Design a protein around this ligand. Structure first.
Ligand SMILES: CCCCCCCCCCCCCCCCCCCC
Ligand SMILES: CCCCCCCCCCCCCCCCCCCC
Ligand SMILES: CCCCCCCCCCCCCCCCCCCC
Ligand SMILES: CCCCCCCCCCCCCCCCCCCC
Ligand SMILES: CCCCCCCCCCCCCCCCCCCC
Ligand code: NA
Ligand code: NA
Ligand code: NA
Ligand code: NA
Ligand code: NA
Lengths: 266, 266, 263, 267, 264
């Protein structure tokens, strides 16, 4: 009787996880937060490589790295806590005492970092037509709502597909509205800056586009092959891999690029 | 079980128990809480040279509060996760005696340090007119401590004895009004003799300070805010913990930022 | 069969601690080490605000140790007493080791010398000799702690040795108080009325705060089986120890930073 | 003994168990490992200004490496101590299922970060002649990632499936010799133009880079380096973890130290 | 059946540790790693109190602090976790599930710090007839051997008195060599510096000499009275170790930071 719990638990409570499935998910989750802390050191140490007016970028990246590190750390410990090795069957099964696994830790992280990552770009690029304050608010309203909704939905990823997908959809709505506004910003930013700067913003968009799309992919990860192929421990491994890749990208790499764009203008 | 003078969370967790969502959300939000604090710290440290030397005590005090909050909020979080365990038979989280009872005391005492720091740091940005610096500082510190110490007491009796609960709570409320009376008196005098940019910020700092500080007494009473009503359940717990976290973030981080920003405009 | 252990354990192994008693003591102890780390940040950031800066450094050195040890204490408290669902009280849990204020005490081995030796980097002595005033502070400082450290193991198993070492320790205490007075005075010489007013406030603080420790030492026996030979005695002791440590190290170091400004 | 695709440490730990020396050493050597990482981190962060502004990216990258290695090598050590417990009856450390199985995985995924960094950093200290910056970088990265990933997979079969083990191992090696080649090509193109001091360092760096990195494969096969012979036991585990440590200290710390000197002698 | 372990375990697995014996060891071990983190701060916040050419010493002192901190911390957690209170007899006995206790953590700590400590002095003083490098390699080769040889032996400090002494002896030989070299390093160090600086170098030599001697004293502790093969011997050993480590790294480092100031 799990209830509204993540499908990792249902997998752990029945089939269990193999050494490879458990270990990899464990390592990939550790790598996640180890990367975040490394990223922090990088942003701080490179604060003096850019002018004074672009530094609020590096700062926000650093703030995000911290936030991320703590929650990705909690998340990794949640994984290892919630699944124990069964010596008589050689598999890792749900361990009631260590609490049920939940990705909500990561989600609420987003609630902090999304608004940060979308806002910090406004400190490097200048807006031609659109208004700083307005673009920000939209980013923040859509950003928050996008997570709050998705956060709510993922609870029902097994106990209720309908609610799962409805919320997932309402979330998706706001998602595109961010993409829209971002593309808008990227352009107005390319207006009046060295080709080098322009090239960097372009690569930032590709990165922002791919990475941010991976998230909803992981949100559905379990069903992307209808009790198919990804409704198993393979689906769990995949989901966490994507998540970790997504974070490293949409945070660290994203921030690095913005740091270079800040130097190109500096 | 026999709990005695314990917080209302423990009685819910010792009877109904907590549903996955209720327990997980509370666990998450409490984690977000202390994550934000350490992040905010990084911000306040790195934005120190963004303001004159005379205003840098503000940022410094903000950074101090951050560390303060991080440690205690961290403790308050681990107090949650360890005081409630999953029951595989009914799939709900129930009071785990060995992990110590849950108490919001860690947080309350977090304030005992910070309430003074927050009321004090604004005095390193603004300048008064008819009020003595120390005179204000003292009234803050006295009313600040008395407010918390009296509330800290009462919240031990929120379940075991409502009359004491409300009495101590009320006595605390008195000191609460006094601190508002004074802080409003301080933002007026502070607004006198400054620019238009600062004038606007402090007006924002006020409403913020107002809404966020009112939340606390709201959370204090949470359970009893709908008469065995609707909030005398796990929902009441979720609400409370959410409210605290939002507030704590606002009262120290947003608040800290607004002040730190106001120091820049100078 | 406890043996030479703090009276927290005897209370915990018999009456047990009530929610309020165990929680408050647990909270106050947490606050304790929280304040230390917070302070660490303060003293590292205010270093600017050059000859005096060794003061801020030493304060920071105290903060670090304080945090690490006061933290250990808190965890020692929480892991040594467990809630009993049947009677609803926190009783001694052996597996988590017996409680002991020994962590605090050894913290003092470090902090006491530093706190004393640091004021010498702000004020300027008249006729007294820097290195001499230092050695006294250190020899006495160390002895005061080592002796009291020994005595507190007997605060229950042997009321005599407890008081003997206690008394001995108290000798070094008064000594230190004497020297520190000789420093406050010689410091007041040749500085604005502000610089003085500060050192005066430092004296009162240092006097009151440092007297709280020996009060805590006897806290159990400050009302004769009295009112303070119970959980309330444990609360009190730990409240006092935290109040002192915050005053003697943080507020203290802050006042030395302010005097370091007027100068 | 139904372990599955697990490292040979568990197979020893669940059968013969580890003696005091064997378990303790491994435990110590692992801890020293992540201690050196945090020690070195400080060194790089404090020597940032001892080199001109264009070379500093090296110092900074080394610092980043140090942090990751710290955490993951920490996790690794905690993995070892949690996965084996003393048995009073026979005084030997045996596998403790509750504390999860042991797996060097933590260290491997460490490399995912650190291998690209260590390779990409030297390109901030030296100047190239024929081959271009980006081209060298991407071959380092692509190859680096593949090498680690194919090795990471293979080590899961170091017992359950000897073939798949050696197969991937070899596949990894391919990407390895590729990295060696492209590196010596960089060391050389680097020596060109710089003082006999910098040139002297690069020489030293190469020696290091070659040895240190060769040690990894050595660890990979540690158990099978003496056939069921002598290294299929607790000693084999000791030897492996010792090597992994020596190798990680050399490949990242000593290495980054040398790239620091080089950055100095090029100011 | 413990096998090749430190006598701490044999005492804890037989006699048991009294509240005091256990609590003190626990405290002193904590104090140890606490001092290390405090020292770190000091050496960081005082880097700028000396000329650039000397600063390397401060940094190396800080490095050592970090290393020491962690490993001492581990050592502390190893002590506390390895021995549990027995409420029925009122003493602390070996808890198998917490791993056996071992000083090995500390020894491997030295495997780093020793090199750094002998090395860092070369960034303050100036030799006269010996080369910077030669002296550094003599230190390092010997410093390593001394630690490894001793690390081995301490595993047999009960199971095998012979191997214990044999390795300890072999280790000592390298110890003397380091005293010889370090002696030559201080004499040449005094050449060409104010008598004030000379005096600090003298103190340093005594500190170095005394504190570094303590270690083999601890190594043997148990057998230093054929009332020391008890819990008292354990207390003694751990106190000495801590005193030594504080002295040989912190105080040592401070005195060098002062010699850097005088020479600035
Ligand atoms: C283990 C913690 C390491 C994370 C990095 C913390 C930030 C370090 C700040 C370094 C700043 C150096 C500036 C000169
Ligand atoms: C877990 C590590 C996060 C703690 C944040 C510590 C902030 C250090 C900032 C260093 C500032 C260096 C200035 C350049
Ligand atoms: C959580 C621990 C935070 C306290 C240690 C942070 C110390 C680094 C701040 C000083 C950096 C200088 C800023 C200019
Ligand atoms: C818990 C120990 C964390 C300290 C390790 C090193 C962190 C780097 C901060 C040093 C900043 C140097 C400033 C010059
Ligand atoms: C938690 C203890 C932190 C000790 C190391 C941090 C030192 C950073 C301050 C350096 C400022 C110059
Ligand atoms: Na697990
Ligand atoms: Na729990
Ligand atoms: Na407890
Ligand atoms: Na173990
Ligand atoms: Na114990």
């Amino acid at each position: 009787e799990l209830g509204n719990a993540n499908f990792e638990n249902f997998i752990g409570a029945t089939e269990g996880f193999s050494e490879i499935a458990y270990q990899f998910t464990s390592h990939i989750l550790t790598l996640g937060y180890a990367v975040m802390l490394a990223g922090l050191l990088y942003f701080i140490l490179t604060i003096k490589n850019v002018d004074k007016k672009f530094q609020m970028s590096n700062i926000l990246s650093a703030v995000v790295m911290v936030s991320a590190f703590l929650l990705l750390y909690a998340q990794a410990q949640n994984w290892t806590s919630s699944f124990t090795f069964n010596e008589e069957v050689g598999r890792y099964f749900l361990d009631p005492s260590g609490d049920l696994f939940n990705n909500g830790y990561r989600y609420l992280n987003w609630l902090i970092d999304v608004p940060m990552l979308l806002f910090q770009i406004l400190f490097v690029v200048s807006l031609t037509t659109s208004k700083f304050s307005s673009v920000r608010n939209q980013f923040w309203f859509s950003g928050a709502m996008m997570i709050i909704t998705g956060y709510i939905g993922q609870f029902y990823e097994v106990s209720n597909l309908t609610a799962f997908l409805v919320w997932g959809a309402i979330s998706s709505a706001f998602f595109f509205h961010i993409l829209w506004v971002m593309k808008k910003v990227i352009n107005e930013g390319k207006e009046g800056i060295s080709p080098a700067g322009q090239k960097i913003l372009s690569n930032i968009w590709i990165l922002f586009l791919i990475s941010w799309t991976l998230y909803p992919g992981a949100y559905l990860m379990p069903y992307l092959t209808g009790d198919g192929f990804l409704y198993s421990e393979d689906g769990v491994m995949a989901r966490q891999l994507v998540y970790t890749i997504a974070d490293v990208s949409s945070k660290v790499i994203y921030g690095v690029l913005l740091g270079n764009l800040a130097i190109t203008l500096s």
